[PDB]
Design an enzyme around this catalytic site. Structure first.
Site, short mmCIF file in Angstrom:
data_model
loop_
_atom_site.label_atom_id
_atom_site.label_comp_id
_atom_site.label_asym_id
_atom_site.label_seq_id
_atom_site.Cartn_x
_atom_site.Cartn_y
_atom_site.Cartn_z
N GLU A 78 -1.36 -8.22 3.25
CA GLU A 78 -1.21 -7.26 4.34
C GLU A 78 -1.69 -7.85 5.64
O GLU A 78 -2.48 -8.79 5.65
CB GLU A 78 -1.98 -5.95 4.01
CG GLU A 78 -1.23 -4.69 4.39
CD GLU A 78 -1.76 -3.36 3.86
OE1 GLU A 78 -1.02 -2.36 3.96
OE2 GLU A 78 -2.91 -3.31 3.36
N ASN A 92 -1.64 5.34 2.94
CA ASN A 92 -1.80 5.99 1.65
C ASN A 92 -2.95 6.98 1.74
O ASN A 92 -4.08 6.60 2.01
CB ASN A 92 -2.08 4.91 0.57
CG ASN A 92 -2.08 5.42 -0.85
OD1 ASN A 92 -2.02 6.63 -1.11
ND2 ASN A 92 -2.17 4.52 -1.80
N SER A 147 0.87 -1.17 0.00
CA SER A 147 0.00 0.00 0.00
C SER A 147 0.90 1.22 0.00
O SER A 147 1.86 1.27 0.77
CB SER A 147 -0.89 0.03 1.25
OG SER A 147 -1.82 1.10 1.15
N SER A 152 -5.59 5.71 -0.89
CA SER A 152 -5.64 4.27 -0.88
C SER A 152 -6.87 3.74 -1.65
O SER A 152 -7.96 4.23 -1.42
CB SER A 152 -5.69 3.76 0.56
OG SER A 152 -5.85 2.35 0.61
N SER A 153 -6.68 2.74 -2.54
CA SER A 153 -7.78 2.10 -3.29
C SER A 153 -8.43 1.17 -2.30
O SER A 153 -7.74 0.31 -1.72
CB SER A 153 -7.23 1.26 -4.44
OG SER A 153 -6.32 2.01 -5.23
N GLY A 175 -2.06 -5.84 -2.24
CA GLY A 175 -1.26 -7.03 -1.98
C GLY A 175 -1.51 -7.56 -0.58
O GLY A 175 -2.38 -7.07 0.16
N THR A 199 -1.63 2.20 -8.26
CA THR A 199 -2.71 2.97 -8.87
C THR A 199 -2.15 4.02 -9.81
O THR A 199 -2.68 4.19 -10.91
CB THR A 199 -3.62 3.52 -7.76
OG1 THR A 199 -4.21 2.41 -7.07
CG2 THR A 199 -4.69 4.49 -8.29
N1 LIG Z 1 5.40 7.93 -10.22
C1 LIG Z 1 4.76 8.73 -9.36
N2 LIG Z 1 4.88 10.07 -9.51
C2 LIG Z 1 4.39 10.87 -8.55
N3 LIG Z 1 3.76 10.54 -7.42
C3 LIG Z 1 3.62 9.21 -7.32
C4 LIG Z 1 4.07 8.25 -8.21
N4 LIG Z 1 3.74 6.98 -7.78
C5 LIG Z 1 3.09 7.19 -6.66
N5 LIG Z 1 3.00 8.51 -6.31
C6 LIG Z 1 2.48 9.08 -5.07
O1 LIG Z 1 2.31 8.05 -4.11
C7 LIG Z 1 0.94 8.00 -3.67
C8 LIG Z 1 0.56 6.56 -3.44
O2 LIG Z 1 0.59 5.91 -4.73
P1 LIG Z 1 -0.50 4.84 -5.16
O3 LIG Z 1 -0.40 4.60 -6.61
O4 LIG Z 1 -1.90 5.33 -4.81
O5 LIG Z 1 -0.17 3.53 -4.31
P2 LIG Z 1 -0.88 2.10 -4.24
O6 LIG Z 1 -1.99 2.11 -5.15
O7 LIG Z 1 0.14 1.05 -4.57
O8 LIG Z 1 -1.32 1.96 -2.77
C9 LIG Z 1 0.16 8.69 -4.79
O9 LIG Z 1 -1.10 9.20 -4.37
C10 LIG Z 1 1.13 9.80 -5.21
O10 LIG Z 1 1.13 10.87 -4.27
MG LIG Z 2 -4.10 1.98 -5.07
#
Ligand SMILES: Nc1ncnc2c1ncn2[C@@H]1O[C@H](COP(=O)(O)OP(=O)(O)O)[C@@H](O)[C@H]1O
Ligand SMILES: [Mg+2]
Length: 753
Positions: free
Chosen positions: A442, A191, A149, A194-195, A440, A154
């Site tokens: 957790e 996060n 997370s 968070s999704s 994933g 996402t």
């Molecule tokens: N390549 C990226 N560029 C800029 N910010 C990013 C990038 N990847 C992630 N982030 C930042 O990290 C935060 C968490 O990413 P996210 O994709 O929502 O994580 P996950 O879905 O794996 O929990 C995002 O809301 C954003 O602020």
């Molecule tokens: Mg997500």
């Protein structure tokens, strides 16, 4: 001479071996003569000779191991190069800030049709490779974006979707994200965005490899979040986007106010994501006392006011009329007012309940917004119908109110997902590219049914990863006589069967409990233990290393692929039922509002088994497509940029299974084509001298004429195999246009003379 040896916070540190003992190596840290520490022989690794260099593909490392891998991604990360390959697998380290221009339209164009390795590593190159494989092999493709997370799954999923639609379209697939995220994403401790649902997003293509539409599959929306959250967490973004951004006209019609005024928001954080500029756009009457005292929540991406604007713009762009927009907001507000309905004890032995007099307004607003009669709503929340209408206790009335709130909101989410699918439909398609973005493995101090379902999901996906990356890949190498050293894995079918087998699996025992006259979480848990006494993957919570005081019928431990998880089984029966009691179902089905009736167009629907069916349909798609993998890495636990926590990243590299496959990947052959297909493609352009050669021999003449190294490829029994870092050389051999084919044949003809 310098080596990598363990370090408690950096994962590894540079040093020199100065002694050897039984089971140990004495290490002197670099530029610290005299100082020493002990390390296990197998925890000391060779280091690359040049410590300042970085490589785009970790397979190019002279000594590829977990330590050199960690260092290489660390050096790249210090220079804002968040993307690195392990052959055709991508490692993506979350930067936690916007890196300028790396996702630009210009950058997108620069990746189109480019072979892997010809451009710097990037999510766009993985997306283009899936597209090229799809078009050339005439086979649908899946891109799996994995990680913890907050790792970036996402964001990377959206980068793939944007790249594909912008590059190969003629847009809605991209614009549908603010909508899904408004209703399915929430602030959690790990996060801010968070999704709280899993998704598989497919982009469908016609025969010409042109985008024709899309399809979003959604999984396991978190229902518990709808009613209560921890103080550092929030409910779904929509509630705060609406409170922060709705016009005064909408605020008045929906009887909204600052988030502290709603029980479904006020146990969580009531502060908005805002900056100096957007905070001035939020009206004073929207701001909670905690927001006025502590100020806004900070985030580089989220902004509740700006996101409300962007979501409304996205709704317009995708074809949602203002009537549908307001219909969605009315349901959201109706759920909020429903949560404000309170109850007090009634009856000489507190066997019943009444709505508190102060809840009068919340009852009126809820019923008006959901098109219900106030009395029918009041009755349904405070009594239950039996085979007689009997009083409910306060706790039972709280449960009825919350059950209705969760079901209405979950049905609203299903409607939004279906509405986005209706905005990019297609009658037929030839192939698709699907992007999987699901939470994933957790575990927390307290693990409930939501964790059980996600961890179950991850057991099944881990099996697919072992089957695709290890089993099927190595079976090809072996069938082709390549002599690649075998990497084995222990299958997790026993853990999967424990959860999902017919009749005896945990999901079927849980459903059995939901169908019993008096359902009990303890009776279910006792039946699990009683049925799986011999099972090595199952144990009572007393065997844990907080879990000491948990009773045998109050939980179970599952020995997963990534660690043992102790699940508290309280609310398992309740969380397993997707259906509302008939009284509440009738109430909402008979709403005066058409939109509300359309959301709902023994009462028991298994959440566990509904998810098992969805996951099996997703696995059917993954097993029938080519697969590309993106491993997202979370650099620290503080959401900060430029803070590479070595030991935390090493742990992800190990837990992801990346470290275990390094040798197989480096010594593997990701590109291959049969001698027959190569020969048949060049055949019509060949003179007699070339055509007379047996397929394998023409391939040898072709590769030698092009100056291909005997190291770069290997001949199998029926196919030619190319190594990591040789994608550009393989694509040039595979390129089918007549001019290119005729030119390589002229080169072979010249070489043969
Ligand atoms: N390549 C990226 N560029 C800029 N910010 C990013 C990038 N990847 C992630 N982030 C930042 O990290 C935060 C968490 O990413 P996210 O994709 O929502 O994580 P996950 O879905 O794996 O929990 C995002 O809301 C954003 O602020
Ligand atoms: Mg997500």
């Amino acid at each position: 001479k310098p080596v990598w040896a363990p370090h408690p916070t950096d994962g590894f540190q540079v040093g020199n071996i100065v002694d050897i003992g039984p089971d140990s190596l004495t290490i002197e840290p670099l530029n610290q003569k005299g100082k020493t520490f002990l390390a296990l022989i197998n925890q000391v690794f060779p280091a690359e000779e040049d410590s300042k260099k970085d490589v785009e593909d970790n397979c190019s490392l002279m000594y590829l191991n977990e330590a050199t891998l960690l260092h290489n991604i660390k050096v790249r990360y210090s220079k804002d190069r968040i993307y690195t390959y392990v052959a055709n697998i991508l490692i993506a380290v979350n930067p936690y800030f916007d890196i300028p221009k790396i996702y630009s339209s210009e950058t997108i164009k620069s990746y189109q049709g480019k072979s892997l390795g010809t451009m710097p590593p990037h999510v766009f190159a993985i997306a283009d490779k899936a597209f090229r494989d799809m078009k050339v092999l005439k086979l649908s493709q899946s891109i799996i974006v994995s990680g913890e997370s907050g790792a970036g799954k996402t964001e990377n999923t959206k980068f793939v979707l944007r790249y594909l639609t912008e590059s190969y379209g003629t847009d809605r697939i991209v614009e549908a994200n603010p909508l899904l995220e408004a209703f399915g994403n929430a602030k959690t401790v790990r996060n801010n965005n968070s999704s709280r649902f899993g998704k598989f997003v497919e982009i469908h293509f016609n025969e010409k490899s042109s985008v024709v539409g899309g399809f979003v599959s959604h999984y396991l929306l978190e229902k518990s979040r709808i009613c209560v959250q921890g103080k550092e967490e929030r409910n779904y973004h929509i509630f705060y986007r609406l409170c922060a951004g709705a016009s005064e006209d909408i605020r008045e019609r929906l009887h909204l106010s600052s988030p502290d005024n709603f029980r479904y928001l006020n146990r969580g954080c009531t502060r908005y994501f805002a900056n100096k500029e957007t905070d001035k756009q939020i009206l004073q009457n929207r701001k909670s006392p905690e927001y006025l005292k502590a100020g806004s929540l900070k985030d580089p991406l989220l902004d509740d006011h700006g996101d409300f604007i962007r979501m409304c713009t996205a709704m317009k762009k995708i074809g949602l009329d203002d009537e549908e927009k307001l219909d969605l907001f009315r349901v959201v507000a109706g759920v909020l007012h429903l949560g404000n309905i309170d109850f007090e004890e009634a009856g000489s032995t507190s066997g019943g309940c009444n709505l508190k007099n102060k809840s009068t307004q919340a009852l009126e607003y809820c019923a008006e917004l959901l098109g219900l009669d106030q009395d029918d709503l009041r009755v349904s929340l405070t009594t239950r119908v039996m085979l007689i209408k009997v009083p409910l206790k306060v706790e039972q009335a709280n449960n009825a109110r919350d059950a209705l709130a969760k079901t209405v909101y979950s049905h609203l989410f299903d409607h939004v997902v279906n509405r986005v699918n209706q905005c990019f439909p297609f009658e037929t398609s030839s192939y698709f590219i699907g992007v999987l973005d699901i939470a994933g493995f957790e575990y927390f101090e307290h693990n409930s049914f939501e964790q059980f379902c996600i961890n179950y999901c991850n057991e099944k996906l881990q099996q697919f990863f072992n089957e695709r990356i290890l089993k099927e890949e190595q079976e090809l190498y072996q069938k082709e006589g390549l002599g690649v050293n075998e990497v084995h894995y222990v299958d997790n079918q026993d853990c999967i069967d424990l959860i999902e087998a017919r009749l005896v699996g945990i999901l079927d025992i849980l459903d059995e409990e939901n169908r019993l006259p008096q359902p009990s979480d303890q009776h279910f848990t006792s039946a699990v233990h009683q049925k799986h006494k011999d099972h090595f993957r199952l144990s009572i919570p007393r065997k844990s290393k907080i879990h000491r005081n948990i009773r045998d019928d109050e939980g179970f431990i599952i020995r997963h692929f990534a660690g043992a998880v102790c699940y508290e089984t309280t609310q398992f029966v309740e969380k397993n039922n997707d259906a509302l009691h008939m009284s509440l179902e009738s109430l909402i089905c008979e709403s005066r509002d058409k939109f509300i009736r359309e959301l709902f167009e023994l009462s028991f629907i298994s959440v566990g088994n509904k998810f098992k069916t969805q996951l099996n349909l997703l696995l059917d798609k993954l097993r029938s497509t080519g697969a590309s993998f993106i491993r997202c890495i979370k650099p620290n636990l503080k959401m900060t940029s430029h803070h590479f926590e070595g030991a935390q990243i090493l742990s992800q590299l190990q837990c992801s299974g990346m470290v275990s496959v390094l040798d197989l990947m480096q010594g593997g052959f990701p590109s291959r084509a049969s001698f027959h297909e190569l020969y048949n493609m060049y055949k019509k352009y060949m003179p007699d001298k070339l055509a007379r050669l047996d397929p394998r021999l023409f391939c040898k003449a072709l590769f030698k004429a092009l100056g291909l190294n005997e190291i770069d490829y290997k001949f199998g029994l029926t196919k030619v195999f190319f190594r990591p870092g040789k994608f550009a050389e393989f694509d040039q051999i595979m390129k089918s246009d007549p001019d290119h084919l005729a030119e390589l044949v002229k080169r072979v003809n010249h070489w043969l003379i």
